[PDB]
Swiss-Prot record, chain A:
Biological role: The proteasome degrades poly-ubiquitinated proteins in the cytoplasm and in the nucleus. It is essential for the regulated turnover of proteins and for the removal of misfolded proteins. The proteasome is a multicatalytic proteinase complex that is characterized by its ability to cleave peptides with Arg, Phe, Tyr, Leu, and Glu adjacent to the leaving group at neutral or slightly basic pH. It has an ATP-dependent proteolytic activity.
Misc remark: Present with 7060 molecules/cell in log phase SD medium.
Cross-link (Glycyl lysine isopeptide (Lys-Gly) (interchain with G-Cter in ubiquitin)): 108
UniProt family annotation: Belongs to the peptidase T1A family.
Gene Ontology biological process terms from the UniProt entry: proteasomal ubiquitin-independent protein catabolic process; proteasome-mediated ubiquitin-dependent protein catabolic process
Principal place of residence: cytoplasm
Pfam short name (any one): Proteasome_A_N
SMART domains documented for this protein: Proteasome_A_N (SM00948)
GO cellular component: nucleus; proteasome complex; proteasome core complex, alpha-subunit complex; proteasome storage granule
Domain of life according to the entry: Eukaryota
Name of this protein: Proteasome subunit alpha type-2
Localisation per UniProt entry: Cytoplasm; Nucleus
Keywords: Cytoplasm, Isopeptide bond, Nucleus, Proteasome, Ubl conjugation
UniProtKB/Swiss-Prot annotation, chain B:
Subcellular location: Cytoplasm; Nucleus
Superkingdom of source: Eukaryota
Gene: PRE10
The protein's name: Probable proteasome subunit alpha type-7
Organism in which the protein naturally occurs: Saccharomyces cerevisiae (strain ATCC 204508 / S288c)
This protein's record includes keyword Acetylation: yes
Residues of the whole record sequence present: 6 to 248 of 288
Post-translational changes noted in the entry: The alpha and beta forms are probably products of the same gene with different post-translational modifications.
Function of the protein: The proteasome degrades poly-ubiquitinated proteins in the cytoplasm and in the nucleus. It is essential for the regulated turnover of proteins and for the removal of misfolded proteins. The proteasome is a multicatalytic proteinase complex that is characterized by its ability to cleave peptides with Arg, Phe, Tyr, Leu, and Glu adjacent to the leaving group at neutral or slightly basic pH. It has an ATP-dependent proteolytic activity.
Keyword entries, A-Z: Acetylation, Cytoplasm, Nucleus, Proteasome
The keyword Cytoplasm appears for this protein: yes
GO biological process, alphabetically ordered: proteasomal ubiquitin-independent protein catabolic process; proteasome-mediated ubiquitin-dependent protein catabolic process
UniProtKB/Swiss-Prot annotation, chain C:
Single GO term (MF): endopeptidase activity
Name assigned to this protein: Proteasome subunit beta type-1
Organism: Saccharomyces cerevisiae (strain ATCC 204508 / S288c) (Baker's yeast)
Gene that this polypeptide is encoded by: PRE3
UniProt keyword Membrane present: no
Quaternary structure and partners: The 26S proteasome consists of a 20S proteasome core and two 19S regulatory subunits. The 20S proteasome core is composed of 28 subunits that are arranged in four stacked rings, resulting in a barrel-shaped structure. The two end rings are each formed by seven alpha subunits, and the two central rings are each formed by seven beta subunits. The catalytic chamber with the active sites is on the inside of the barrel.
GO biological process: proteasomal ubiquitin-independent protein catabolic process; proteasome-mediated ubiquitin-dependent protein catabolic process
Entry-linked InterPro entries: Ntn_hydrolases_N (IPR029055), Pept_T1A_subB (IPR000243), Proteasome_bsu_CS (IPR016050), Proteasome_sua/b (IPR001353), Proteasome_suB-type (IPR023333)
Keywords for the protein's UniProt record, in alphabetical order: Acetylation, Cytoplasm, Hydrolase, Nucleus, Protease, Proteasome, Threonine protease, Zymogen
SUPFAM superfamilies according to UniProt: N-terminal nucleophile aminohydrolases (Ntn hydrolases)
KW Transferase (keyword) present: no
Curated annotation (Swiss-Prot), chain I:
Location(s), subcellular: Cytoplasm; Nucleus
Coiled coil recorded as keyword: no
UniProt similarity note: Belongs to the peptidase T1B family.
Protein role: Non-catalytic component of the proteasome which degrades poly-ubiquitinated proteins in the cytoplasm and in the nucleus. It is essential for the regulated turnover of proteins and for the removal of misfolded proteins. The proteasome is a multicatalytic proteinase complex that is characterized by its ability to cleave peptides with Arg, Phe, Tyr, Leu, and Glu adjacent to the leaving group at neutral or slightly basic pH. It has an ATP-dependent proteolytic activity. This subunit may participate in the trypsin-like activity of the enzyme complex.
InterPro entries (alphabetical): Ntn_hydrolases_N, Proteasome_beta_3, Proteasome_bsu_CS, Proteasome_sua/b, Proteasome_suB-type
Protein name listed in UniProt: Proteasome subunit beta type-3
Length: 250, 243, 196, 244, 231, 195, 226, 241, 204
């Protein structure tokens, strides 16, 4: 009834490769395509809701998750690993930031904390790395809008636009041709839907696509009135109807 | 291959080979049985007389838990003792908190979860015993049998060890021939017979019979050993049936 | 506080006043001191309101987990869990709890757990500051195997007197009836019980 | 039990080498090259970003050059995530020293502390070492301008000019050829960029691929200024030195 | 073969090889005999020397005034187990003013040995013990194996060539059990039993070790010229 | 321990510390040196609870000597005083605090300046031209306020110190058995053997 | 401090005065004693002000995480249970006395909680040094089936009784209304009946009145380039 | 090849121990089914008592976790009971801490997170079970949430688990393709149980007696299991139309 | 015996039009004994100013603590901390020593670099925030300062008028306190310049 794995399960091979990290990246490659695009007045993150059965209710499975009111996350790879990372990311935003500074962390620092948790699963005793790559989109007052990718190694990079998982190589080429520094949010959503159609085989609609934005403040979603400085969350998950509306102008 | 070298490793079948190897140690042990009767339970066990130098009636194998539960087992005897020691701790803490003595199904799960926990890690070995146990609680008589995997079910009759097939067949006859049920005193006699019949699998060495029972009418719902005239009556009945 | 539990032919009835005081100020005049730890096991609370609430919540947790595993607990079992908490934490608790419940096998049972954490199974029990004034009345008027209406009258009259003499007690007389039929709440207002 | 699966990260080979340290160094040899050059009036840190994509947001990106305090900076070669764990420890150590003594931490003391942490992972704990090599560029009032390097073994050494990561053999020869002791910061900037331009595995050296920094005692009124170069400023210094 | 690297691993036939290898250490050890009547219980032990300059390794250890054992196998493991028995005998006396039953002493040794066979990192005990005692139900003799199995007997022997002594006791059973109120004759039977396990060497004055416990006899060990009487 | 004085002049720091050690009824010693050399150009005098004073001083001495060997370098008086303050500030919220008051007189070889630091048992640090602990300041500060100049020589500092000690010997009820005087300057630490 | 809670038809209202005091001295004349735990769960706080802010923010933080974990809007009974178990553990040393009110999918709720961990249920509650003055008003004018407008009126009248009659309370009335199926409306300084009158004199000094020894520029900027 | 013995990645990015735990799932050779009514959630499971010496009342793979939540398990009984005891403890702790009954979907998530840990941490093996949680949730209504050894979970309109799960799944898929609703449009739970049993008979192609089935029913504020005589009444009604 | 009045001293902060002011006396004592006339009680971390009264060892300890924390903040955030954020950091830090507190009365003052808004705040020894529009007072003559500020203060004073108001508030409060005085300092803070002025006052 002992934990006897106090030694690293990820180690350097003779060629300098960290095998378990590479194999985690291979698991991410098999995962469903997800992408992120940054506009001047917002960020969009999107993915396919690959339903494991038609009897399953794919609304109950959230691939796109709110981390803070101004930060959202999407993934490619192993879903269960993502779910526990979201739980830890939400909690670390409070314990190592909000309970100290009385405000939510900026995107880059929350990303840094997630990256740290993933790095530790790459060096600590008796654990394998997380088999996910995350795309974290967010806004904060001093940095503005931003989009970050986080890999199983714990490495993170800021992107203007990117894609991860199944059809990422093709999707990144598509985003290079379309992306410019003068995009509005609606233009980025349009490009996101165009890019994502290429990697989807079957049905392509609001029920099979999950899409969220980091944009303007939503005082209608705040839940209370009376404090002028609190203007509401910038994270908003688009509805099934809102996606289908934009697919007609596609 | 290599899946059978470490406990808690799933083979490509979905099996835990180390648990299946513990079963082999159980199959190698002496025969033990349990019979559920009208208002209680009867336990019996085969004790192989390795030598004349063994003191008769002294090396007692059946163990009591609390005052109302009997436990008998086949396989590695020390593993069985370790399991009963745990059972006694579980029964003590239950009674400490809840006042009432531990119910038999509750007690069965306490042993079950503990045995199951020894299939979860490579740092421990599975239990090398199948345990037949039971007694009388507020809801009546209960007989259980618990395997190395942590699996257990309730039984009408139970048997384990080297002579288990022989015993099981004899128990199945009693179930068919007595649907209304069996009395406590009948079950003691039948238990003696079944151990004697099951001794054909261990026929090289002679043996010593040991019986215990809990019965609401015969023992006030307490576990007691069958001794003296009642034990000899059961031996005589058993000896008459084999001839 | 004036609280009592009384066994009768069909089961058991718990009774209580509704007053909670901080010094001479009545912090709550409509307090509910009859609290449920299981469907048919309730208790009357006296002493530190923080302590008796904390204890009762833990007991309700223990009996819920008991029920998931072993089916419905006895009233004796519930009293034992209360006792374990009260006895082992006697140095840091001020709690005087009466446990009352209905089995079909055992029928109505009452257990009182005073400050020390001892247990005492009784036909009826009285407790709280106002109970001192009705030891005489309750001993003279209690009978075993009373009807429901007689037992309600016995509790009503008893707590009426406890309320009359004890400043710490007052407000409404709440009662909870535990029988095979189910769980019935009763309430009795000042204009009713004062004129008795 | 568990013994079966243990790689045993902290053992000697028959030749007296630490397997995991040697393999971590092999990992580091594939990382983008980082160069440090120390002059009389300052220190230059130049480093090559590894991944080139047009879509990478360069102005907000940091994989190579990190600030430890106002006087000390590091250039990283190896696993970026491993480096950030160590960097945060060094940042805390610097502030602990400042709290205790009310003076900025001397460069060597910080370097020794980090190097000791790396050493620990090679001698006990059964964990893999950190796959990181640092170049430390710093200033204090005792020794003035200092360059150091540390590697996964926990060994550190002092340098006038040094490279880590890819093509260090080639890079160290080129530096050894053109370095002189009386050299100045503006000359050292030019040497660092010329060296990277020759050793790079890429077809050409451009601004979007580089991180660049200078520590100068050429702040207003005898103070020391760290300057992490912006993308546009790296583009300007590439045109000035005549590489693009 | 593949399943003997540690105690935590069952073989495909349900065997624990590390326990069986510990059992083998006992067979290599020097012979010791145990036997009892209704009044007394006796240990007789053939001690082993390293060479002619060396002392003879002590085989018998006292656990209490009414109990003690003889060892065969790893002597440091007997020291660990006898120290544990001393403490349990002592705990019984101090807390309950009660002499520890010999049967209960066997149960404690069984359970201590068992824990070492089921967990990783540990090893089984590499020693076999013969415990004699006189308690409230008379004389007792136990045989402890480091598998955990403890067995109450009239007589037995463990160690190298122990089968010869064990056969003799099996024949003599009806005679030596009746040797009541005569400690010298019971020891004689034990000395005659251990003689069946000798080859080449014979029982000398610093070779032989005898212990006895009984009705009005505390556990006492006899070595040196004290055992010359029985040679 | 009773009286410890400090005065920073032009080119040195002078520490004067009483020689008496009293244990209740009797004066057990009249030649006690209430000081430790922390480094070649840093001296610390101390006064407070019995046992704690010396234990603390020697603990500080060991740590500064350890630092000196590790870095092959003498810490500045400011750095030493900050280290000492933190240890006392750590001490005050402990299970059993060090009841020790100190003066740290040092010559900063980098800045070529004498420096005097006053730190009480709570960890209250102040840099001063002259300082004291306990009741010593009550008698002496009026004289120091009057006569002190920042450009005084070492000999003038000693004469002003004699006046302070004379006032202490006149008006204090306790016999502190005179003072040991030590000077800290660019050449190190030396004791004035006749005072 | 005077704080109240009043149930009504389709929700609950809480209110508070705005005076924070150290002994007999008024530290803040416009203090906010109404705290958000979640968007639709607010509480009014009395007792040690650091303790009330700390316990609200801790439970509020854990409530938010719980809401995200369960994909459900937070319940008042959860805020109550977490507050009481925390306060009980600290045996009254965390001096927080709170009136906890809110709306959730279960309905509208009103509780009080004391520093030792006892909780209470009611249609109208008061806490703080002005609680007796407030409760007098509540006991005189409360009825069943109050409208929103009647509950706001009653609540602010109860706070006024505290403001005027209790020395520990003063200045303004803050109100928060939590109605079922609507956003909670926080009404900061709902009443302002204690504006200071214009002073008789201006105390603005002539420039150069104060004697100065030294002037210097303080460098707030970082170390500069070049 | 020790990447197949513990839960670390193979070169393909696979966890073989997780995959083999899924195979242990079908070791009992028992098929389960869960469907939703208007006011209820029904779960049915095959019951096989091969030995005549067994007490058939003690043979069960349906568990009463809390009053509101029921759980059926597909997998060996020791791992089933391990999961059952834990789910009971987690449901009780939740009620104590947060003051309301643990929702079905939240329990499923919690047990899924625990299962995820066994796929990441080496010393703990996965449990070889699929857990199907059922309730009538006070916010979401009739609910089916299923957990597996990978740590995956999701909500279901209806679901099936076991060796012959695909046959049952396609049968259910086809019914909901006709009706075009997310549930069985039926008022009484009795008729929803009759639907569940009927559609299992059609999918598996086998007839059932009262002792061959085991039924669990979730209603508002209680989950309960049907007796052999309650099932017999269900089987009589099916045969009579 | 009372830790908050062993050493003595005061801090006052005020807001004006596009500016804030913070000011403190210079005394450190051991009860009746005056020890230092140069013990400054105002510190700054970038453009955020922190005054601290109370026990002097804790004043020094907290300054060293917030320097530590704001340095690490700046390295990670890549920007200087703002007054609003720092105020929450001070509160968090004090409350984490709830049952063994620092015996201090901190006062935050500064201008938000992005919004340009003047900001002041005060705290009790365990971290309760008083965010006043007008003024914040702290120390052994806090009552005296409350009296001065309440009558002398008017809103939207220009920087050079605000200097006179805060100076006269501090000086006359300190002269009615035995444990305060021995010199004084006044910081006038604008968005991108800060002037520091030492005041001449009675030295008793
Ligand atoms: Cl979880
Ligand atoms: Mg009254
Ligand atoms: Mg695992
Ligand atoms: Mg004064
Ligand atoms: Mg004066």
């Amino acid at each position: 009834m002992t934990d006897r794995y106090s030694f690293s399960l990820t180690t350097f091979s003779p060629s300098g490769k960290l095998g378990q990290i590479d194999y985690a990246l291979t698991a991410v490659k098999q995962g469903v395509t997800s992408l992120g695009i940054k506009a001047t007045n917002g960020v969009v993150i999107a993915t396919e809701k690959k339903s494991s059965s038609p009897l399953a209710m794919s609304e109950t499975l959230s691939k796109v998750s709110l981390l803070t009111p101004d930060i959202g996350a999407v993934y490619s790879g192993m879903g269960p690993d993502y779910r526990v990372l979201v739980d830890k990311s939400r909690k670390v935003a409070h314990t190592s930031y909000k309970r100290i500074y009385g405000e939510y962390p900026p995107t880059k620092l929350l990303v840094s904390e997630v990256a740290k948790i993933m790095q530790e699963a790459t060096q600590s005793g008796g654990v394998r790395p997380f088999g996910v790559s995350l795309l974290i989109a967010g806004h904060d007052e001093f940095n503005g809008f931003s989009l970050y990718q986080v890999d199983p190694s714990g490495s993170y990079f800021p992107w203007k636009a990117t894609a991860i998982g199944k059809g990422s190589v093709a999707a990144k080429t598509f985003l290079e041709k379309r992306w410019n520094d003068e995009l509005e949010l609606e233009d980025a959503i349009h490009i996101a839907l165009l890019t994502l159609k290429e990697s989807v085989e079957g049905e392509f609609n609001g029920d099979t696509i999950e899409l969220a934005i980091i944009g303007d403040e939503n005082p209608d979603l705040l839940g209370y009135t009376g404090i002028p400085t609190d203007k509401g969350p910038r994270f908003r998950k688009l509805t099934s109807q809102e996606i289908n509306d934009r697919l007609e102008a596609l | 291959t290599g899946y059978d070298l470490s406990n808690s490793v799933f083979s490509p079948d979905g099996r835990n080979f180390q648990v299946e190897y513990a079963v082999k140690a159980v199959e190698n042990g002496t025969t033990s049985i349990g019979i559920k009767c009208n208002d209680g339970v009867v336990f019996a066990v085969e004790k192989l007389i390795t030598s004349k130098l063994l003191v008769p009636q002294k090396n007692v194998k059946i163990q009591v838990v609390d005052r109302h539960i009997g436990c008998v087992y086949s396989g590695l005897i020390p593993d069985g003792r370790h399991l009963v020691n745990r059972g006694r701790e579980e029964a003590a803490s239950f009674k400490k908190l809840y006042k009432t003595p531990i119910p038999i199904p509750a007690f069965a799960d306490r042993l079950g979860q503990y045995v199951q926990a020894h299939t979860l890690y490579n740092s421990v070995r599975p239990f090398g015993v199948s345990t037949i146990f039971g007694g009388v609680d507020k809801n009546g008589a209960h007989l259980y049998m618990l395997e190395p995997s942590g699996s257990y079910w309730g039984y009408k009759g139970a048997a384990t060890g080297k002579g288990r097939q022989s015993a099981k067949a004899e128990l199945e006859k009693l179930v068919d021939h007595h649907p209304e049920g069996l009395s406590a005193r009948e079950a003691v006699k039948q238990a003696a017979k079944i151990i004697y019949l099951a001794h054909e699998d261990n026929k090289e060495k002679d043996f010593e019979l040991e019986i215990s029972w809990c019965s609401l009418s015969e023992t006030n719902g307490l576990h007691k050993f069958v001794k003296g005239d009642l034990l000899q009556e059961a031996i005589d009945f058993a000896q008459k049936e084999i001839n | 506080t004036s609280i009592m539990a009384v066994t009768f032919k069909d089961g058991v009835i718990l009774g209580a006043d509704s007053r909670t005081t901080t010094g001479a100020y009545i912090a709550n005049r409509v307090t509910d001191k009859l609290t449920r730890v299981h469907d048919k096991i309730w208790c009357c609370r006296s002493g530190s309101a923080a302590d008796t609430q904390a204890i009762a919540d833990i007991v309700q947790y223990h009996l819920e987990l008991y029920t998931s595993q072993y089916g419905t607990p006895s009233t004796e079992t519930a009293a034992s869990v209360f006792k374990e908490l009260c006895y082992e934490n006697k140095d840091n608790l001020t709690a005087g709890i009466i446990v009352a419940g209905y089995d079909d096998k055992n029928k109505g049972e009452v257990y009182t757990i005073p400050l020390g954490g001892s247990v005492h199974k009784l036909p009826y029990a009285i407790a709280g500051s106002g109970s001192t004034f009705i030891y005489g009345y309750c001993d003279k008027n209690f009978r075993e195997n009373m009807s429901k209406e007689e037992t309600v009258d016995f509790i009503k009259h008893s707590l009426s007197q406890a309320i009359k003499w004890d400043g710490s007690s007052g407000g409404v007389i709440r009662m909870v009836v535990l029988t095979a039929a189910g769980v019935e709440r009763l309430i009795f207002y000042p204009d009713e019980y004062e004129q008795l | 039990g568990s013994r079966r699966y243990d790689s045993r990260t902290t053992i000697f080979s028959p030749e007296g080498r630490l397997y995991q340290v040697e393999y971590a160094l092999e990992s580091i040899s594939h990382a983008g090259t980082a160069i440090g050059i120390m002059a009389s009036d300052g220190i230059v840190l130049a480093a090559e970003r590894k991944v080139t994509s047009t879509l990478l947001e360069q102005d907000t990106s940091t994989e190579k050059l990190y600030k430890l305090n106002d006087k000390i900076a590091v250039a990283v070669a190896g696993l970026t995530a491993d480096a950030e764990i160590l960097i945060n420890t060094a940042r805390i150590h610097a502030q602990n020293y400042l709290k205790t003594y009310n003076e900025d931490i001397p460069v060597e003391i910080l370097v020794r502390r980090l190097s000791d942490i790396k050493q620990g992972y090679t001698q006990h704990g059964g964990l893999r070492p950190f796959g990181v090599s640092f170049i430390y560029a710093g200033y204090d009032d005792r020794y003035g301008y200092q360059l150091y390097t540390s590697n996964p073994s926990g060994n550190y050494t002092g340098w006038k000019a040094i490279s880590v990561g890819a093509n260090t053999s080639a890079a160290q020869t080129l530096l050894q050829m053109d370095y002189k002791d009386d050299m100045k910061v503006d000359d050292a900037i030019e040497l660092a960029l010329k060296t990277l331009s020759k050793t790079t595995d890429s077809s050409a050296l451009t601004y979007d691929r580089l991180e660049f920094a200078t520590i100068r005692k050429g702040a207003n009124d005898g103070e020391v200024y760290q300057k992490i170069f912006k993308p546009q400023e790296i583009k300007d210094i590439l045109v000035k030195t005549g590489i693009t | 073969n593949n399943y003997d690297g540690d105690t935590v691993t069952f073989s495909p036939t349900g065997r624990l090889f590390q326990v069986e290898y510990a059992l083998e250490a006992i067979k290599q050890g020097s012979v010791t005999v145990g036997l009892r009547s209704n009044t007394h219980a006796v240990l007789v032990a053939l001690k082993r020397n390293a060479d002619e300059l060396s002392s003879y390794q002590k085989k018998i250890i006292k656990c209490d005034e009414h109990m003690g054992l003889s060892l065969a196998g790893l002597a440091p493991d007997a020291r660990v187990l006898s120290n544990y028995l001393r403490q349990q005998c002592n705990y019984s006396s101090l807390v309950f003013n009660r002499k520890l039953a010999v049967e209960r002493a066997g149960h404690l040794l069984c359970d201590k040995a068992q824990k070492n066979t089921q967990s990783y990192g540990g090893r089984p005990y590499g020693v076999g013990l013969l415990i004699i005692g006189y308690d409230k139900s008379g004389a007792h003799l136990l045989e402890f194996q480091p598998s955990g199995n403890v067995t109450e007997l009239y007589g037995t022997a463990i160690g190298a060539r122990s089968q010869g002594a064990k056969t003799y006791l099996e024949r003599t059973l009806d005679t030596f059990i009746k040797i009541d109120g005569n400690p010298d004759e019971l020891i004689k039977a034990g000395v005659e039993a251990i003689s069946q396990s000798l080859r080449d060497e014979s029982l000398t004055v610093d070779n032989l070790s005898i212990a006895i416990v009984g009705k009005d006899t505390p556990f006492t060990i006899y070595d040196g010229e004290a055992v010359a009487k029985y040679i | 321990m009773d009286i410890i004085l400090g005065i920073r002049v032009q080119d040195s720091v002078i520490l004067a510390s009483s020689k008496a050690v009293t244990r209740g009824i009797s004066v057990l010693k009249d030649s006690d040196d209430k000081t430790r050399q922390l480094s070649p150009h840093t001296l610390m005098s101390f006064a407070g609870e019995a046992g704690d004073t010396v234990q603390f001083a020697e603990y500080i001495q060991a740590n500064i000597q350890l630092y000196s060997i590790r870095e092959d370098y003498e810490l500045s008086p400011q750095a030493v005083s900050s280290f000492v303050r933190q240890e006392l500030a750590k001490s005050i919220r402990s299970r059993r605090p060090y009841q020790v008051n100190v003066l740290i007189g040092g010559y900063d070889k980098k800045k070529n300046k004498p420096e005097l630091y006053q730190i009480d048992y709570l960890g209250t640090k102040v840099e001063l031209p002259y300082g004291a602990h306990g009741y010593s300041g009550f008698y002496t500060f009026s004289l120091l306020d009057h006569h002190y100049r920042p450009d005084m020589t070492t000999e003038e500092g000693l004469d002003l110190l004699k006046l302070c000690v004379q006032e202490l010997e006149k008006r204090m009820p306790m016999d502190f058995k005179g003072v040991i005087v030590k000077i800290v300057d660019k050449d190190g630490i030396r004791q004035v053997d006749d005072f | 401090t005077t704080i109240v809670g009043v149930k009504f038809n389709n929700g609950v209202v809480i209110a508070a005065d705005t005076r924070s005091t150290q002994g007999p001295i008024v530290a803040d004349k416009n203090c906010a004693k109404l705290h958000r735990i979640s968007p639709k769960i607010w509480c009014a706080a009395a007792g040690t002000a650091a303790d009330t802010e700390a316990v609200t923010q801790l439970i509020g933080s854990n409530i938010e995480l719980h809401s995200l974990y369960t994909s459900r809007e937070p319940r008042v009974v959860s805020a109550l249970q977490m507050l009481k178990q925390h306060l009980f553990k600290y045996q009254g040393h965390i001096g927080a006395y709170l009136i906890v009110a809110g709306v959730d999918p279960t309905g509208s709720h009103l509780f009080s909680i004391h520093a030792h961990g006892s909780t209470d249920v009611g249609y109208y509650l008061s806490l703080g040094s002005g609680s007796l003055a407030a409760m007098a008003v509540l006991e005189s004018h409360w009825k069943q089936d109050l409208t929103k407008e009647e509950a706001i009126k009653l609540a602010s009248d109860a706070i006024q009784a505290g403001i005027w009659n209790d020395l520990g309370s003063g200045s303004n009335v803050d109100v928060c209304v939590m109605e079922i199926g609507k956003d909670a409306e926080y009404l900061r300084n709902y009443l302002t009946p204690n504006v200071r009158e214009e002073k008789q004199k201006s105390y603005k000094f002539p420039r150069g009145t104060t004697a100065v020894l030294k002037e210097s520029i303080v460098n707030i900027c970082d170390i500069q380039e070049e | 090849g020790y990447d197949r013995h513990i839960t670390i990645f193979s070169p393909e990015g696979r966890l073989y121990q997780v995959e083999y735990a899924f195979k242990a799932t079908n070791q009992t050779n028992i098929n389960s089914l869960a469907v939703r009514g208007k006011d209820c959630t029904v779960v049915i499971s095959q019951k096989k008592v091969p030995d005549k010496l067994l007490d058939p009342t003690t043979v069960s793979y349906i568990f009463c976790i809390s009053r509101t939540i029921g759980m059926v398990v597909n997998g060996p009984i020791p791992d089933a009971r391990n999961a059952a005891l834990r789910a009971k403890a987690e449901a009780a702790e939740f009620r104590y801490k947060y003051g309301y009954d643990m929702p079905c979907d939240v329990l499923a998530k919690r047990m899924a997170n625990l299962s995820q840990i066994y796929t990441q941490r080496a010393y703990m093996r996965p449990l070889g079970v699929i857990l199907t949680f059922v309730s009538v949730d006070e916010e979401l209504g009739p609910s089916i949430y299923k957990t597996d050894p990978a740590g995956y979970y999701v909500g279901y309109k209806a679901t099936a688990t076991g060796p012959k799960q695909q046959e049952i799944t396609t049968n259910l898929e086809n019914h909901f393709k006709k009706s075009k609703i997310d549930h069985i449009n039926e008022e009484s739970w009795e008729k929803v149980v009759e639907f569940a049993i009927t559609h299992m008979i059609d999918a598996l192609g086998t007839e059932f007696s009262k002792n061959d089935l085991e039924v669990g029913v979730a209603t508002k504020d209680k989950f309960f299991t049907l007796s052999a005589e309650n099932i017999e009444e269900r089987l009589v009604a099916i045969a009579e139309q | 015996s009372d830790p908050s009045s062993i050493n003595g001293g005061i801090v006052v902060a005020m807001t004006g039009k596009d500016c804030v002011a913070i000011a403190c006396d210079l005394r450190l004592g051991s009860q009746s004994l005056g020890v230092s006339n140069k013990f400054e009680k105002i510190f700054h971390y970038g453009h955020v100013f922190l005054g601290i009264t109370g026990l002097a060892t804790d004043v020094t300890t907290l300054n060293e603590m917030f320097r530590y924390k704001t340095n690490l903040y700046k390295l990670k955030e890549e920007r200087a901390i703002e007054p609003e954020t720092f105020t929450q950091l001070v509160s968090s830090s004090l409350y984490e020593r709830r049952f063994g507190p620092y015996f201090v009365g901190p006062v935050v003052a500064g201008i938000n670099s992005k919004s340009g808004k003047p900001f002041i705040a005060g705290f009790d020894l365990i971290g309760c925030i008083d965010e006043a529009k007008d003024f914040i007072v702290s120390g052994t003559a806090s009552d005296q300062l409350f009296g001065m500020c309440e009558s002398l203060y008017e809103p939207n004073l220009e920087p050079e008028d605000l200097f006179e108001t805060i100076s006269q508030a501090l000086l006359n409060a300190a002269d009615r306190d035995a444990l305060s005085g021995w010199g004084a300092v006044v910081y006038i803070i604008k968005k991108d310049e800060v002037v520091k002025r030492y005041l001449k006052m009675r030295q008793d």
